[PDB]
């Protein structure tokens, strides 16, 4: 065993890059020598050294001038680490339950100096694929509406991922650098996981997507318990999030029409206002039905009535 400082000196790699290497691989107690020896043989060290040399050469060019050289100088993924930490696809799905919370949180974070707009765009786009896949296999089984958010539980081949959907409200902003590395690793994992899931679903990947619809709602309505709400069509009022209600109905096999679409079999209308003028129903009815497949009539969730005690479904 060697000290953390001793291991860093042996690797002669700054602590900033050692954090990334440990996060990708995982080393902890003071630390066993064998883990450090295995890490030293990883190819990621060569790539990190190449990146450092690229940065120093770019700085040299910028200081000397001739910006053309810096532009011309501009000419990786941790695939190997994925296999090591995830020997098999079921292991990756198991690790998803805690890994993907960071990605889903980042999907709604605002752009700032600490996070580039590209990272947020990629995180949001990853959701557009995750929800699209989940709305085709109809693996949604829980819809606990928690204060932290709607605690979704998609039965991803029997591991019941506990991913949480943060609310659409502004998430006002800790060392994001570690969070950035975790997000990068989770996105690299998500690329292959989504590829595998789409290949299993039988749909040609990558499939076509619609952008005009994206410019209207920007979400699941693009990029092309289960027995509930068959062929059901619900109207959403101006007091509910379409991003959540529409996904559940689409997974169930129904359809949703947005009130703000211009900002029939209409069996129900989701409304929360005390004043109303379709079967008017509170949003709690859909969640309660999905949580247990009750398919209870609307009589138990008329607007303005006392809400029932929604015990946590766990």
């Amino acid at each position: 065993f060697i000290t953390r400082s001793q291991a860093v000196r042996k690797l002669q790699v700054s602590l900033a890059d050692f954090r990334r290497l440990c996060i990708f691989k995982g080393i902890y107690p003071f630390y066993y020598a064998k883990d450090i020896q295995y890490l030293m043989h990883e190819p990621v060290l060569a790539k990190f050294r190449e990146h450092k040399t690229f940065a120093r050469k770019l700085t040299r060019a910028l200081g000397r001038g001739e910006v053309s050289s810096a532009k011309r100088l501009e000419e990786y993924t941790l695939d190997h680490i994925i296999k090591e930490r995830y020997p098999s696809f079921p292991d990756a799905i198991r690790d998803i339950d805690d890994a993907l919370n960071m990605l889903f949180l980042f999907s709604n974070l605002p752009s700032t100096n600490q996070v580039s707009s590209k990272i947020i765009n990629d995180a949001q786009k990853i959701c557009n694929q995750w929800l699209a896949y989940v709305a085709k296999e109809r693996l949604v089984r829980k819809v606990f509406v928690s204060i932290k958010g709607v605690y979704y539980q998609a039965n991803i081949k029997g591991e019941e991922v506990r991913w949480l959907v943060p609310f659409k409200f502004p998430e006002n902003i800790v060392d994001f650098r570690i969070m950035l590395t975790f997000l990068e690793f989770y996105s690299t994992l998500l690329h292959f996981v989504l590829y595998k899931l789409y290949t299993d679903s039988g749909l040609i990947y990558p499939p076509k997507l619609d952008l005009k619809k994206d410019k209207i709602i920007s979400g699941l309505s693009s990029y092309i318990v289960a027995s509930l709400f068959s062929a059901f069509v619900f109207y959403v009022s101006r007091e509910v999030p379409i991003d959540i209600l529409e996904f559940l109905i689409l997974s169930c096999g129904g359809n949703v029409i947005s009130e703000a679409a211009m900002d029939s079999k209409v069996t129900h209308q989701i409304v929360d206002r005390p004043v109303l003028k379709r079967t008017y129903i509170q949003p709690q009815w859909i969640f309660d039905c999905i949580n247990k497949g009750e398919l209870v009539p609307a009589n138990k969730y008329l607007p303005g009535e006392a809400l029932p005690p929604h015990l946590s479904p766990w």
Partner: protein, 155 residues
């Protein structure tokens, strides 16, 4: 004690005029190896499938720069102060003065070379330019060649 022929350097062009000279020289930076190679590849591709004005660039090589000097082809000469072999540049100001060519001294050979791609250039010169060259030459004259015309004195 330094002889009068030495110490002509170290006393160099002022900050503003030096910056203006650097900016003017940056307008005629010679094509770098990568740019020249890509231009030649493009020309070959165009000719291989389906006659230009004479180029202009700064003169930097000591041998050919001196060759242009004496022939009166050097419109302006810029010399570095920190050159290790002083004898390489001791006679250059004297030759420029004898031939009647504007000349100037700068501090930092590496900064001199940074505008000509090469790591170091020792000296630099210009053969052709648009019209600010005359103003820069007049400024350099009035600030170094005429104001410090007594360089032959002191020790």
């Amino acid at each position: 004690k330094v002889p009068p022929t030495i110490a002509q350097f170290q006393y160099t062009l002022d900050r503003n005029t030096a910056a203006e000279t650097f900016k003017l020289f940056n307008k005629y930076r010679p094509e770098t190896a990568a740019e020249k190679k890509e231009r030649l590849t493009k020309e070959a591709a165009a000719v291989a499938e389906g006659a230009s004005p004479k180029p202009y660039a700064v003169k930097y090589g000591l041998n050919h720069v001196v060759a242009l000097i004496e022939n009166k082809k050097a419109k302006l000469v810029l010399i570095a102060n920190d050159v290790d072999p002083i004898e390489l540049v001791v006679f250059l100001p004297a030759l420029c003065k004898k031939m009647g060519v504007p000349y100037a001294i700068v501090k930092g050979k590496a900064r001199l070379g940074t505008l000509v791609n090469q790591k170091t250039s020792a000296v630099a010169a210009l053969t052709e330019v648009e019209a600010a060259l005359a103003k820069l030459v007049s400024t350099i004259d009035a600030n170094f060649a005429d104001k410090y015309d007594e360089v032959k004195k002191h020790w």
